[PDB]
Design a protein around this ligand. Structure first.
Ligand SMILES: CCn1c(-c2cc(N3CCN(C)CC3)cnc2[C@H](C)OC)c2c3cc(ccc31)-c1csc(n1)C[C@H](NC(=O)[C@H]1C[C@@H]1C)C(=O)N1CCC[C@H](N1)C(=O)OCC(C)(C)C2
Ligand SMILES: Nc1nc2c(ncn2[C@@H]2O[C@H](COP(=O)(O)OP(=O)(O)NP(=O)(O)O)[C@@H](O)[C@H]2O)c(=O)[nH]1
Ligand SMILES: [Mg+2]
Lengths: 164, 169
């Protein structure tokens, strides 16, 4: 069965709501397992406390830099970076969960959630999950973004983990 | 106080943002933070005149090569940046210049060629190669390092001088 993880989102420290994701371990097991482990924190590091550093209305919300907290860091459970597992899944519409990167085979911990179809990223970013519950929370995050992605409030992953 | 609309262009990773942040903020970080789009303002004195520099720092990521026309129409002068240890970024220069001339429909657009990262020992673009390219464009060539600040003010200020001459012709 595909695992489910959750983020509890806060805005300047005030709770907004919970987003949960299905992780497609059946199609991209290594990539799903990285995101799962970072969501539970079970390696001694992970998403909890980190922020969505880039939010561009009409496109996506990007987060996951828990090592430098400036949009340039993050690391995987396999080392600093790991290879693109496959490009089977596509950026079909809002709610797709996909890996950020610095080019081929540079997956770490940064990820993005689509708020529209972004098909030009197909074959360049590994899709590995989708929002299951709480897409209206992601929609509510968009107004704290901007054209180039700078946020006007601090959007944080106040808590995160794995659901049964 | 005269305002100048400068645009920094070039292949991804050549140091467009490092150069701009060094001018604006007087510091350098080695982390890679690829640009979406950023704008900055800086007041300077060039040849005894107060100038306001409006600087557009653009994305080098080649995926979005089709989304440059609007900023090229708006910009008044271009800092065309390559890295002296990246021969492909030096080839990319001519494509940027052709696009700017194409979009602005003019052979006479203020530009400066910038060869960045001159602090590095691993040079693959020799200085004569660059000087002759710039000579064939009719534009200045300035070698810079955003890491040491070598040539950084000179690159931006020379571009302002190129715009100034274009206006006062
Ligand atoms: C031309 C202006 N622009 C644009 C753009 C594109 C369009 N259209 C494209 C499609 N057509 C059909 C319609 C028009 C319209 N409007 C804009 C913006 C709003 O105009 C200002 C984008 C973009 C991306 C980068 C640079 C410039 C860019 C960039 C620069 S680094 C990058 N991408 C990839 C990015 N790596 C990182 O962060 C590395 C540091 C970490 C480790 C990354 O893995 N992810 C995840 C996927 C999304 C991507 N970030 C991102 O943020 O995408 C922004 C987006 C708006 C989706 C695309
Ligand atoms: N040694 C050295 N490194 C430099 C210099 N300028 C930039 N760098 C480094 O080169 C990398 C890319 O720099 P950056 O300014 O982000 O390049 P960019 O042209 O703005 N990239 P993009 O087009 O993706 O926004 C960074 O690791 C930065 O520290 C320089 O003069 N010397
Ligand atoms: Mg940049």
């Amino acid at each position: 069965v595909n695992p489910t993880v959750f983020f509890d989102i806060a805005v300047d420290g005030e709770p907004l709501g919970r987003v949960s994701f299905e992780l497609f371990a059946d199609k991209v097991p290594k990539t799903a397992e990285n995101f799962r482990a970072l969501s539970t924190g079970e390696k001694g590091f992970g998403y909890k406390g980190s922020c969505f550093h880039r939010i561009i209305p009409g496109f996506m919300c990007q987060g996951g830099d828990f090592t430098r907290h400036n949009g340039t860091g993050g690391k995987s459970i396999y080392g600093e970076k790991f290879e693109d597992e496959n490009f089977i899944l596509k950026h079909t519409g809002p709610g797709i969960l996909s890996m950020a990167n610095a080019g081929p085979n540079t997956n770490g911990s940064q990820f993005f959630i689509c708020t529209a179809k972004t098909e030009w990223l197909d074959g360049k970013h590994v899709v590995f999950g989708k929002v299951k519950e709480g897409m209206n929370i992601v929609e509510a995050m968009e107004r704290f973004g901007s054209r180039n992605g700078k946020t006007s409030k601090k959007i944080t992953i106040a808590d995160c983990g794995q659901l049964e | 106080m005269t305002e100048y609309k400068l645009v920094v262009v070039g292949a991804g990773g050549v140091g467009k943002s490092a150069l701009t942040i060094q001018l604006i903020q007087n510091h350098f970080v080695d982390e890679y933070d690829p640009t979406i789009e950023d704008s900055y303002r800086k007041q300077v004195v060039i040849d005894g005149e107060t100038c306001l520099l409006d600087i557009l720092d653009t994305a080098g990521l080649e995926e979005y090569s089709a989304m440059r026309d609007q900023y090229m129409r708006t910009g008044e002068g271009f800092l065309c940046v390559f890295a002296i240890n990246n021969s492909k970024s030096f080839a990319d220069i001519n494509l940027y210049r052709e696009q700017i001339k194409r979009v602005k429909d003019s052979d006479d657009v203020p530009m400066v060629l910038v060869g960045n990262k001159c602090d590095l020992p691993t040079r693959t673009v020799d200085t004569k190669q660059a000087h002759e390219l710039a000579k064939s464009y009719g534009i200045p060539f300035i070698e810079t390092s955003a890491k040491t600040r070598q040539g950084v003010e000179d690159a931006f200020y020379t571009l302002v001088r190129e715009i100034r001459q274009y206006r006062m012709k």
